[PDB]
Design a protein around this ligand. Structure first.
Ligand SMILES: *[C@@H]1O[C@H](CO)[C@@H](O[C@@H]2O[C@H](CO)[C@H](O)[C@H](O)[C@H]2O)[C@H](O)[C@H]1NC(C)=O
Length: 130
């Protein structure tokens, strides 16, 4: 499913993502935008290290979810990677909260670093009523 910007903003707010681990909703919005264009079905395979990023947050199969075909996977979110391809993002959100509990926090998503860090991201939630 391809969320509409504000639809996503409110869905994320409902799920307690605003200010979670000190991360604003606008920052979460900027990262989902550049990681997947708000598409829950986005999948990106890395032929180099044989791992795949799944869902709206592009979470990695080596560390967070298990897809049965990734060498050295840890499955720290304790979910099937397929759970990150549902239209309902409750699972992807619970896993994204787990990802930020790492020392690097939100730096785990380089697309956040490239497109969100040190820029004005207030436009990602403007007009959404959140
Ligand atoms: C993207 O891949 C990163 C590795 O290139 C990964 O970062 C690693 O995550 C580990 C989790 O146990 C640990 O914190 C390493 O120190 C860290 O480098 C990052 O988590 C991945 N991002 C996503 C969204 O899955």
């Amino acid at each position: 499913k391809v969320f509409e910007r504000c639809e996503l903003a409110r869905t994320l707010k409902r799920l307690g993502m605003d200010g979670y681990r000190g991360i604003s909703l606008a920052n979460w919005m900027c990262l989902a935008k550049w990681e997947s264009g708000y598409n829950t079905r986005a999948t990106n395979y890395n032929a180099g290290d044989r791992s795949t990023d799944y869902g709206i947050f592009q979470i990695n199969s080596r560390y967070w979810c298990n897809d049965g075909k990734t060498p050295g996977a840890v499955n720290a979110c304790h979910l099937s990677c397929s759970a990150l391809l549902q239209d309902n993002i409750a699972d992807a959100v619970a896993c994204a909260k787990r990802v930020v509990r790492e020392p690097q926090g939100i730096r785990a998503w380089v697309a956040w670093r490239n497109r969100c860090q040190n820029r004005d991201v207030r436009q990602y939630v403007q007009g959404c009523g959140v």
